[PDB]
């Protein structure tokens, strides 16, 4: 996250922190995700495409810090790692950048809601807020595009939804942005997601409810003029989601 504030898991209790275990015993952060039901965390396919083995991954919930423990966190194994069949990566962007992780603790239990762990609601199909709506993004991503280290404390910021019409202008993304994607940015270009925030939630208030409206997917640079964050448009994937989870 570029700009915005430090926060704690309590303000974003659906945020999942996803890590990869390495062959030399080392364990490193991969991506964010969101708890959409007790056994299910949604994220981005591109996070897992290079190393498709569900056994390499650990998911934490209730976690406010990147490399140290938070009181109230719960560790999970991944029972299945469901990647989109139609995922693809361009020279620029990702398509169908959505993934599901079914989680269980070594004790075979799914998420118990907590002061620090809550599920987030999916939107109604094809139902999105209007351009110019303020929304929240959360992550452990870089605080500046040039950093080599990630912050230790979770962060969040607010961005505004951009119209597909405006997102497609040539000095913004053009034809790279499809209707399966949502753009969002600061009107002054001062805040944005960044590397290491991918997979994480874009959360908007849609008809009263805090709704998961997008998944951090890509953008050129972080907080760069005319270059908004781009997100997977969740409302366009409900049937994919219902297929894979109604199990």
């Amino acid at each position: 996250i570029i700009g915005g504030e430090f926060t704690t898991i309590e303000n974003q209790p659906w945020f999942a922190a996803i890590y990869r275990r390495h062959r030399g015993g080392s364990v490193t952060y991969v991506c964010g995700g969101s708890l959409i039901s007790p056994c299910w965390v949604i994220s981005a396919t591109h996070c897992f495409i290079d190393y498709p083995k569900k056994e390499d991954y650990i998911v934490y919930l209730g976690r406010s810090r990147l490399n140290s423990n938070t009181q109230g966190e719960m560790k999970f194994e991944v029972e299945n790692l469901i990647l989109h069949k139609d995922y693809s990566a361009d020279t620029l962007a990702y398509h169908n950048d959505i993934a599901l992780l079914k989680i269980r603790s070594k004790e075979g239990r799914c998420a118990q809601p907590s002061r620090t762990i809550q599920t987030i609601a999916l939107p109604s199909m094809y139902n999105d807020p209007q351009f110019g709506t303020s929304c929240e993004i959360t992550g452990f991503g870089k605080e500046q595009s040039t950093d080599y280290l990630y912050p230790e404390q979770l962060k969040m910021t607010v961005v505004k939804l951009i119209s597909h019409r405006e997102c497609q202008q040539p000095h913004y993304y053009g034809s790279e942005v499809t209707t399966k994607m949502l753009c969002a940015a600061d009107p002054q270009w001062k805040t944005d997601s960044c590397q290491g925030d991918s997979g994480g939630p874009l959360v908007c208030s849609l008809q009263g409810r805090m709704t998961l409206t997008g998944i951090v997917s890509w953008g050129r640079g972080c907080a760069l003029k005319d270059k908004p964050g781009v997100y997977t448009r969740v409302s366009h994937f409900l049937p994919w989601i219902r297929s894979h989870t109604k199990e």
């Binding site: 952060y29 996070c47 361009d90 020279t91 962007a93 990630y150 991918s198 890509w218 050129r220």
Partner: peptide
């Protein structure tokens, strides 16, 4: 990697 990825491994 795609040129505009915000993935940590990219």
């Amino acid at each position: 990697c795609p040129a505009y990825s915000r993935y940590l491994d990219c």
